Amino acid sequence: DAGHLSFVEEVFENQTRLPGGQWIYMSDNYTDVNGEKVLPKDDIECPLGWKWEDEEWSTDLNRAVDEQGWEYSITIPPERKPKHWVPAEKMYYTHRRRRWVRLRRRDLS
């Protein structure tokens, strides 16, 4: 009854392609919201003292994503990376990502 802290981990699965081409995996390929590498979701461990509450990672289709959980972008060059993501695939989009989440908890007592 001391309660627990909760935290939802969030990581992004990234893919790219050439216009009109097939999607493939980035070098990093898992990152956070802004582009920094993290490990593949399935290899991600809780910090010391925490445990997973959700049995599985999940991807939330109520967000602005397509029916498989992807949002899409393109780099608009003055910029160095994608900045604005959208739910619909268009043939000239070169980047896409899928947001995966999983709840963990830490008991206070």
Residue numbers in the entry: 943 to 1051
Text of the article:
Mutations in dysferlin, the first protein linked with the cell membrane repair mechanism, causes a group of muscular dystrophies called dysferlinopathies. Dysferlin, a member of the ferlin protein family, is a type II anchored membrane protein with a single C terminal helix buried in the membrane. Dysferlin is not a part of the dystrophin-glycoprotein complex, but its function is linked with calcium-activated membrane repair caused by fusing aggregated intracellular vesicles with the sarcolemma at the site of injury. One DysF domain is inserted into the other DysF domain, by gene duplication, forming an inner DysF domain and a two part (N terminal and C terminal) outer DysF domain.
